[PDB]
Design an enzyme around this catalytic site. Structure first.
Site, PDB file in Angstrom:
ATOM      1  N   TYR B   8      24.018  74.895  44.644  1.00  0.00           N
ATOM      2  CA  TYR B   8      24.278  74.691  46.059  1.00  0.00           C
ATOM      3  C   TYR B   8      22.856  74.984  46.520  1.00  0.00           C
ATOM      4  CZ  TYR B   8      29.267  75.787  45.233  1.00  0.00           C
ATOM      5  OH  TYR B   8      30.567  75.850  44.817  1.00  0.00           O
ATOM      6  N   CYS B  11      22.013  77.820  48.771  1.00  0.00           N
ATOM      7  CA  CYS B  11      22.608  79.076  48.306  1.00  0.00           C
ATOM      8  C   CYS B  11      21.540  79.943  47.649  1.00  0.00           C
ATOM      9  CB  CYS B  11      23.728  78.792  47.306  1.00  0.00           C
ATOM     10  SG  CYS B  11      24.024  80.139  46.114  1.00  0.00           S
ATOM     11  N   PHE B  13      21.509  82.329  45.491  1.00  0.00           N
ATOM     12  CA  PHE B  13      21.570  82.483  44.054  1.00  0.00           C
ATOM     13  C   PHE B  13      20.933  81.291  43.341  1.00  0.00           C
ATOM     14  CE2 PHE B  13      23.648  86.256  44.812  1.00  0.00           C
ATOM     15  CZ  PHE B  13      24.698  86.082  45.686  1.00  0.00           C
ATOM     16  N   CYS B  14      21.075  80.106  43.916  1.00  0.00           N
ATOM     17  CA  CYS B  14      20.485  78.921  43.318  1.00  0.00           C
ATOM     18  C   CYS B  14      19.008  78.849  43.687  1.00  0.00           C
ATOM     19  CB  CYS B  14      21.225  77.687  43.797  1.00  0.00           C
ATOM     20  SG  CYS B  14      23.009  77.913  43.638  1.00  0.00           S
TER      21      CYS B  14
END
Ligand code: HEM
Ligand code: HEM
Ligand SMILES: N[C@@H](CCC(=O)N[C@@H](CS)C(=O)NCC(=O)O)C(=O)O
Ligand SMILES: N[C@@H](CCC(=O)N[C@@H](CS)C(=O)NCC(=O)O)C(=O)O
Ligand SMILES: [Cl-]
Ligand SMILES: [Cl-]
Lengths: 274, 274
Positions: B8, B11, B13-14
């Site tokens: 994503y 996002c 985390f990405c």
């Protein structure tokens, strides 16, 4: 290197530390913590037992999580690296719960901070090392959750267990008599919630037996312990966790219906052999 | 060594994984995951994005947690050890929540599986190593919790953010128009709870500015990045986390009120310089 272990004797997390110290024939003193007033722990900003403070004459460091204590101490025994630096590799990781509660988990808790030589010296098998890690975590994320619902599944066992708690641990003469009944009652009911919350079968004994079989199966028939020749941190972990029930119905049941006794006695005697 | 990153884009985390791959000039393909239907992920038993599958011709392993991916790939780049063995040192630890929910955490997630030589090659300073570990964890246990409440603190910013979400990510023409408004509304309200649950100040911006100052102070004035000469996993972590806000009000505010921009641009250009 003086070791003082603050603990609750019949508490699995402490039984674990003892299993480890006992097996590595490390001399240590234990100061039993009063579970109600916890005065003997008022000095530590870390509010859970076991806690173990190691002293090197003037120096002294406090090791906190039970698995962290074992890992710190263990890597210490093989690397010789100063303990004040090692507890540094097992950082206390604070984080706010999804429910808003401050929680601390210890990073790398199941990993020995060893170098190539050292590792080969204790595992001699790359996979053997990740294996104890996996079972170490299994011991306290699944195995321990099988204890309460088992040793408190019945008002009788409940009383038997809490009786064994007051006798073993540190309770005043009065806070003991009361605690036995209030305690067993509390724990009997509370274990009901634990039984539920942890997804245990209705027949709590069956989760225990299955866990045991899973372990013996994992150990296999090609080796005494998971650690192979001698026990490693995983054997000590499961053993440490299971011992807490010695003397209780659940334990005899466990022993009589699972084929796990031979491995258990093997660790017990491996330990008694200092 | 083919890398496919399921993500994503907006996002954190990405963004972290990309910051890492980008910096280590690792070629990879990205397949944007539809946050609603998540079809492109239906193949993984691991239900969270990012996920990154690495392929060596016939072989192929799936790396799951964002920090685990970064740690696996990184130790991979320095040790050369086969990746199928390395993900083994970052075991998925299942455990039942105190609320009864099955949760998975990844062991050793912030520790590079390196030997003495290797370590000296990437840290040259024992303390420098435990340092990125501490800040890496800080990046996603604290810093990220500051994003939503900041980029969704106002209905306007909410819309601005979710607009940037639908455009950036993978949403059908219809599930996009709807998702922008339903999304912003949902996230605007939900961020309120997050603001509370995570103990943020009423003026959510202040938590962000403080976090930034803490970081710049940590980096200090004696080095370009925490990694010193070049950025280490900690710089990439914080950077990766903050980038997700680029283009939003919170980011301009962050940049205009904190002295963090010079470090930020340093990492950005350190990356663009393949
Ligand atoms: C004094 C004797 C004690 C014994 C024998 C004992 C025993 C145990 C056992 C067997 C468990 C695992 C059962 C389960 O999680 O379902 C457990 C867990 C726990 N105990 Fe104790 N305990 C004692 C005292 C205490 C006290 C006084 C506290 C509170 C201050 C406490 C807090 C906890 C907590 C929070 C857990 C869960 C830890 C985790 O999530 O892994 N215990 N205890
Ligand atoms: C599609 C674009 C998405 C973006 C830009 C996004 C962004 C973020 C951000 C900024 C956070 C950190 C904020 C905070 O924790 O207070 C976060 C956390 C989280 N997101 Fe997403 N997210 C997206 C989609 C999703 C979806 C579809 C799900 C559910 C399937 C999801 C589940 C979560 C969860 C569970 C966390 C908390 C993780 C943790 O505890 O560290 N997100 N997301
Ligand atoms: N994961 C910890 C367990 C700590 C724990 O749950 N200890 C309990 C006793 S069984 C305690 O002292 N309770 C304090 C609390 O949870 O507030 C370890 O392995 O040491
Ligand atoms: N700690 C994980 C975060 C995983 C995560 O929270 N991913 C979210 C997207 S932001 C997701 O896919 N949600 C699935 C879920 O939580 O059920 C990492 O670093 O990869
Ligand atoms: Cl307390
Ligand atoms: Cl799903």
């Amino acid at each position: 290197l003086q070791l003082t272990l603050y603990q609750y004797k019949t508490c699995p997390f402490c039984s674990k530390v003892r299993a480890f110290l006992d097996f590595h024939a490390l001399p240590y003193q234990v100061v039993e913590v009063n579970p109600v007033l916890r005065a003997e722990i008022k000095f530590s900003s870390y509010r859970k037992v076991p806690i173990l403070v190691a002293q090197e004459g003037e120096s002294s460091q406090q090791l906190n999580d039970s698995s962290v204590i074992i890992s710190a101490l263990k890597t210490y025994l093989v690397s010789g690296q100063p303990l004040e630096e090692i507890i540094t590799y097992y950082p206390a990781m604070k984080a706010v719960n999804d429910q808003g509660k401050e929680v601390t988990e210890f990073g790398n808790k199941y990993w020995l901070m060893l170098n190539e030589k050292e590792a080969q010296q204790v595992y001699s098998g790359k996979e053997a090392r990740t294996e104890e890690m996996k079972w170490r975590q299994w011991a306290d994320d699944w195995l321990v959750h099988l204890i309460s619902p088992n040793v408190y599944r019945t008002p009788t066992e409940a009383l038997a267990s809490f009786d064994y708690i007051v006798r073993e641990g540190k309770f005043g003469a009065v806070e003991g008599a009361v605690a036995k009944y209030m305690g067993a009652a509390a724990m009997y009911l509370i274990s009901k919630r634990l039984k539920s919350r942890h997804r245990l079968q209705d027949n709590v004994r069956e989760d225990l037996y299955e866990a045991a079989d899973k372990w013996v199966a994992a150990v296999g028939k090609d080796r005494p312990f998971m650690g192979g020749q001698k026990p490693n941190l995983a054997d000590l972990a499961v053993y440490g966790v299971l011992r807490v029930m010695e003397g209780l119905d659940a334990f005899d049941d466990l022993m009589q219906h699972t084929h796990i006794q031979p491995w258990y006695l093997r660790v017990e005697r491996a330990i008694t052999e200092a």
